[PDB]
Amino acid sequence: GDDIYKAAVEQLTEEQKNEFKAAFDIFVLGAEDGCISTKELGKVMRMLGQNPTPEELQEMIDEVDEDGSGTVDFDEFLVMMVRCMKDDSKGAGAGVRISADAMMQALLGARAKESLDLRAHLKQVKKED
């Protein structure tokens, strides 16, 4: 049931559909496997205010793993974003729940993410950034 997940390509903004390349690219920047692992996780988690455990990262990855060895494909990420907007809470059983925009703004956060107002999904008191 990956209708909006796989079709997210058209659901993504004008800059998002193009940021999905550099975004995930930074996650595996210099990766010999080409994919993301529990190691790279903590590397990005800090960029989005998050300091989980080395054993917990296996959970947020297991639900998005293809090989089943603490990892995730490049496509499993694209959906993780479009699915996050509606499912801000996918972890279930942790201290908090990571969002999608939080990952994008952390990964690149320079190109453009206001063309469609993706960060507007969290209309609430924020910082000056």
Ligand X SMILES: Cc1cc2c(cc1F)OC[C@@H](NS(=O)(=O)c1cc(C(=O)N3CC(C)(C#N)C3)c(C)[nH]1)[C@H]2O
Q: Which residues are annotated as a binding site?
A: 65, 67, 69, 71, 76
Q: Which of 8, 12, 35, 61 binds ligand X (CB under 6 A)?
A: 61
H or E segment at 72? strand 71-72
Q: Which residue is nearest to ligand X (CB)?
A: 91
Q: Phi and psi (nearest 5°) for 36?
A: -105, 145
Q: Which of 15, 25, 56, 75 binds ligand X (CB under 6 A)?
A: 56
d(CA 40, CA 72): 11
97 binds ligand X (CB under 6 A): yes
Decide: 27 and 36 in contact? Cβ < 8 Å. Answer: yes
Q: Phi and psi (nearest 5°) for 47?
A: -70, -20
Q: How far is the CB of 51 from ligand X (least distance, A)?
A: 7
8 binds ligand X (CB under 6 A): no
36 binds ligand X (CB under 6 A): yes
